[PDB]
Amino acid sequence: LQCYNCPNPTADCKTAVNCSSDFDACLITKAGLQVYNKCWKFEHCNFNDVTTRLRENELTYYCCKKDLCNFNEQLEN
Amino acid sequence: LQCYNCPNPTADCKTAVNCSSDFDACLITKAGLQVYNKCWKFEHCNFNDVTTRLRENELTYYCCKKDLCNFNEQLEN
Amino acid sequence: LQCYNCPNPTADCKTAVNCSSDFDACLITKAGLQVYNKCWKFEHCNFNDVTTRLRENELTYYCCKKDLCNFNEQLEN
Amino acid sequence: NSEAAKKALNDYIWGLQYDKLNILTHQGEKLKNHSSREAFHRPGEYVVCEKKKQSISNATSKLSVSSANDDRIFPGALLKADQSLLENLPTLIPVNRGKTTISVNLPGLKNGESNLTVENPSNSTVRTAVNNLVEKWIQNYSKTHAVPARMQYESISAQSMSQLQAKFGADFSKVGAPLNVDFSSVHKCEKQVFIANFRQVYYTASVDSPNSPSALFGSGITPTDLINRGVNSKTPPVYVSNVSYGRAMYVKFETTSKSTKVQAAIDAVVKEYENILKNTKITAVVLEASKVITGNIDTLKDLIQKGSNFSAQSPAVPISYTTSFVKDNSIATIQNNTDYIETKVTSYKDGALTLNHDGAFVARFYVYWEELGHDADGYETIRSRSWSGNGYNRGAHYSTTLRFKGNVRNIRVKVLGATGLAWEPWRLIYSKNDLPLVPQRNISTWGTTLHPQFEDKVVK
Amino acid sequence: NSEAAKKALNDYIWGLQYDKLNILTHQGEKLKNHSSREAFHRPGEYVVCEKKKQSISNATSKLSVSSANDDRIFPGALLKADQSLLENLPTLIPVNRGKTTISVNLPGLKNGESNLTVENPSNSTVRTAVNNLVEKWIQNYSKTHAVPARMQYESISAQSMSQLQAKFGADFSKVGAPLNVDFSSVHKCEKQVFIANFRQVYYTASVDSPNSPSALFGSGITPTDLINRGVNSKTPPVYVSNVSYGRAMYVKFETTSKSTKVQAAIDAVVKEYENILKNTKITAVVLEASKVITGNIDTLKDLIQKGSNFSAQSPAVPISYTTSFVKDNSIATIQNNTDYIETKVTSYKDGALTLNHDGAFVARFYVYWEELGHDADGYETIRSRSWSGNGYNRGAHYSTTLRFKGNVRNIRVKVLGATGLAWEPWRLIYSKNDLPLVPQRNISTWGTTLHPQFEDKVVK
Amino acid sequence: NSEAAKKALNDYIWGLQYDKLNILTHQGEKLKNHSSREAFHRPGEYVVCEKKKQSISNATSKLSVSSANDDRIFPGALLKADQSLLENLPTLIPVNRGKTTISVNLPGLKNGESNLTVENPSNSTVRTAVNNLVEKWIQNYSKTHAVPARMQYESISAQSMSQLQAKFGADFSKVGAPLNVDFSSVHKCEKQVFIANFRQVYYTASVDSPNSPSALFGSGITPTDLINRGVNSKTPPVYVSNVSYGRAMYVKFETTSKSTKVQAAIDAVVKEYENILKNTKITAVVLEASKVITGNIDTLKDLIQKGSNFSAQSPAVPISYTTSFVKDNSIATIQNNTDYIETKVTSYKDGALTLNHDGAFVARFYVYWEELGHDADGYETIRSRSWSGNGYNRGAHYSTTLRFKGNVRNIRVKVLGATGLAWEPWRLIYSKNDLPLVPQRNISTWGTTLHPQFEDKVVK
């Protein structure tokens, strides 16, 4: 229900609030050092989807159905 | 019946709970050294299924169906 | 109908018990060092079910319908 | 008169009443609550019997047609419900019998040559009527006559006789007496009896619905007459409705080998069974009888080869019977029961089992067995046994023979490649457990050290 | 007469009221849901049993007819709606019947040949009438008529025989009785028996519904006549509305193997596996005429192929019928049920697995196995099984044997071509999981340590 | 007489009115809308079924007819609006009909001349009239004329007998019994079952809608008899208007290989695929047949080529009908609606990825994947998957097969041909996104640093 949403990419992902139906799941991504977790539409969850809504090219991401259950450290290293 | 439902894979084995159909099976996984005893779905119990829901490739495992009988020493190295 | 009905993986039979349900016979099994005697269902008496319920590939057994006739030394060596 | 006869017979027969199945329920043998599995050893032989309760309560409304009951074929022969009737004894009665339409059905029959009527039903009268009808149809069409292939082939384990009193009927008690179904030996768990009944209808007969019981009587019957005539309330009248006529072949395969393959064998020649038949001395009986009593390969396919055509050569018999209640024209039926023991029996083989260790690589032979037995109490058991030189070395060439008795079960054989390394020094060429009993087996190993092969060989 | 008789019979039966599907319903066997999964190991075989409840409740209006019921069935005949009708125990009535036109469905007749009329309907009269109507067309046009009617190709497993009485009809209880259908075996998981009905309806006959109740009686039914003829409210009067005809057969296949490839055998005979054929043990009741009697691959094929069409001689017998509540002339219908713990039985072959390493490199194997079993309490379990020889080196050539037993499931393999290079000298050639059960798999590696090739052969 | 009867009857039936389309509406399975997605893993296959409520709401007046109701099928009778009428078990009636005409679609006329009539219909009368006209036209001109030669070949996933009840009518419930449809295996994602219904029209018969109510009954119909007949608003009269004529074929393609390719499989036979057809479990019913009874690769081809080209070899059988409320005299339509689950029949499989590197330059592959996974409840999720050979050096040649499983999704590849120049020592030869799974994908590189050229082979 209440999902993580930072409009500003952050490694320390803290700002998590109750959001609407637009997103479907909690999506965290990491590019180099930058980390961005956010309420994300799981259909609009796609490697290409993330890379286009982030204007960046190379990354490693993960989106999980249940909100707030998504964080960077689950990705390798 | 009562399955052992560990919260997160660890050498600790004390939390035994009377579980729902998620006690379709009692699950215990020794991956490397980390051990996890959870409520589980038996038809959903297999090498593949448990390796997915545990996210790692290599694994040693045992499933029981009867109450709590799936145990740590039940696994042998 | 007094078999040896006492689960013990040891060299001594503890208590001679009149079992009915799983005393269709009484069964003793020596696997290397360990030995186990208990009431047993005679149709379920066979090499393969024993080695499964034991997981040990080298074993010997003796199952007999007669009461307590499955005593330890009735198994040889 | 005949109207008053009809009225009185309908009235009394309505006052007549009975649970028709009660008077027509039968029981054969009965056995107390015994069941047991027991083994037995013999010089070069082994057997296991499962003597288990056999109980059947089967019934029908097809009734047999045999000599002691042949007296009332050409249906319509009204009877009086009795246990004589239950066990196939009909009641003749010098009654004035009234006109009724009787009709026999045939393949291809003429437009109007299935309808008949008889004023005074009597075996002579109705017999001549149906004789002349079937003679018309036998001269008219039997050149191109073909059968509706009603092959009612039947096979049963003839382990019990009361089972053959319930299933096939009470009267068989006599008709099997020449067939010699030695069920008693089966109970003694020594000999095996399998019965095969080929049957076939060539035609059958029919009677109009009796609007009255005296619609059968000639005219003017009074109830107290039928009373004096023997048909009474305690033995109520039963209105026969059909007799079936055709071909039969009533074979009993008699053989000791308790492998149930016999019931394949008995029919595999109607299609190993060869040798199990080789010493059977089969006995047969037909209800060209002597052409069967000698027995040959194609007797049954002859019972259609000739049994497609009808001729004047050799007798084909009326094959079945039936009858219905008179009081309400309700269908009548038997209820025969049997209770006895069935013994499902088997056998297992002692023979020379040769272990031929001839491979240039000295393997070590772990061999293990299960052994089902008893001692001193008769209480069942089964135990583990293992090879003499179990996992113990054997010479470079070693052909050993074992009096491999068929009493043991569930063999396991691990042949062992010998290695000198530390990590798992016990090297496997062939460890298969739970392997089949080979009476005479040349169990040899073979191959090279870099490729060790097993040989699951039979000597022969 | 028949007018006052009509109004009397109508004032009588129109008030009589009950549900057919209540008096006519055969809910034979009831069974609690017992869910028993179980297993069994035999020499080189794994077996699972699934005793799971399966109720089978059916309803139908096509009331079957076979040999032992032939003579009493034909249209327009009144009956008393009772369990009599249910198990095909058809009861008659003494009531005189009245003027009725009788209709048939015959392909090709010309404008006058399909209708008749009988004043006093009688088995003889109407039977010879319809036989006449047949004899018209049998010789006239049979040269170029091929009635393409239903080739009902029905198949089912011969499970608890009450489920057969439900899915197929009550009266089968007798006609399939000689089919050598093992009740307990399937009921108790011994053997596999599949029954397959084959048909072709030839034609049928039909009654015009009574515009007059006494158009069913011979001009003058009285309610006291009807009741003296045994008709009451409990077993009400119904009138047959159909009799059907044609070629029929109930062919069986009786073999040890489960896994309904049995049905593959049935069809590809109607249309190794060679040995599941070799294990036929067929037993069939049928209804050239000698290839009828032998029974084999070509026999049924031809009989449904060249014999299915109207025979060179004659069709067989009435196949079915139906009736209708005289009150409202409402159509009748059976309701036959049976509940049984269906055991959809499945086998698992003893797998074998040879491990061959002919590659130049030294490969290291880990073979992960699944294991389905129980734990000492009848409770299920599933477990891992580790390749005990893991982390081991294998020669330039290599071949070992492994009982990849029927107890094994969901295998996974990692093969490791060892490389003399420094950057992770562990080079993965082949990891693959979730493979099927192979009776004889050969995992043979190949190639060089620079390019490790592989072969996954099935020698068989 | 019949005029006062007609005036009373018109008032009667006009008062007997109710909603035809709701007295005839069959609303079937009531389902909650839920989409339950869930995946399963066959040994090497990744199936994903999302069961979903799929509401099949349907209505029609194309009321099909089968064998079990040929006894009542023709236009002209008078039926009663009831669940009986609903479930295609027609109701009888003691109605003696009146003068009415009947029309017959004879191919070869140039006006409405081939018409007939009956003053008092009876199934025999109207039946022989219609069959007269049929044989009349068959013997005259159909030898030398054309016929509609078109393909009406319906198909559907037999997801439910309620789904099939809404799709193809209610009474298919009984007629689909021998079809061998395991719609429950579809309910549990075990196998997939599609029916292909090729109906077959040759002709149809019609009848003049009621122009006079008492032209539908013998002269002098009184509504008092009709309520004595049960003809009243409770079950008001209905007027059959048409009956079809032809054949049918319900091909049941049932495969264990769960896919949509099933229909292509059918279309591979209608006009590799060897495999999809190899698990056909074809089970055809028929509503001569020998042409299908033999079985071949073009049996449908000729069944439309010759069977749909229906000739004078043998006329067809009645196939369907329709009716009309007697007052309405207008089309009568059942509304057979159902909801039902809709398994997402989708399926996916592993596929090798042969990373082959042959180029003369130092190449390095990075392959990224999307990754279908589950978390902590079985909850669905997608994941990044990074190449293990990423950051991993590869020689002049590097060919390893990645077990690129269909369980993996959205693959993307980058291949690096590294250069010797200090500034940007990297050169891209190949990089691709939006590429699908490949069974065997030899992704090869060739050439040298100055010209790195690609190869994308699917050896398959």
Numbering used by the authors:
A (entry chain D), B (entry chain B), C (entry chain F): 1 to 77
D (entry chain E), E (entry chain A), F (entry chain C): 56 to 326, 335 to 350, 356 to 528
The authors write:
Here we report a structure of an early prepore-trapped conformation of the CDC ILY solved by cryo electron microscopy (cryoEM). We then used cryo-electron microscopy (cryoEM) to visualize this ILY variant in complex with CD59 anchored to cholesterol-containing lipid nanodiscs. The final local resolution-sharpened density map illustrates an arc of five ILY–CD59 complexes, with the central subunit best resolved. In our complex, ILY extends to a vertical height of 110 Å, revealing an oligomeric prepore that has not yet collapsed towards the target membrane. In our structure of an early prepore, the h-helices of ILY are arranged parallel to the membrane with their charged surfaces facing the outer leaflet of the lipid bilayer.
Cholesterol-dependent cytolysins (CDCs) are pore-forming proteins secreted by more than five genera of Gram-positive bacteria, including human pathogens from Streptococcus, Clostridium, and Listeria. Other CDCs, such as intermedilysin (ILY) secreted by Streptococcus intermedius, achieve species-specificity for their hosts by hijacking the cell surface receptor CD59 to initiate membrane binding. CDCs bind target membranes through interactions located in their domain 4 (D4). A long extended domain 2 (D2) flexibly links D4 to the membrane attack complex perforin (MACPF)/CDC domain (comprised of D1 and D3 together), which is responsible for pore formation.
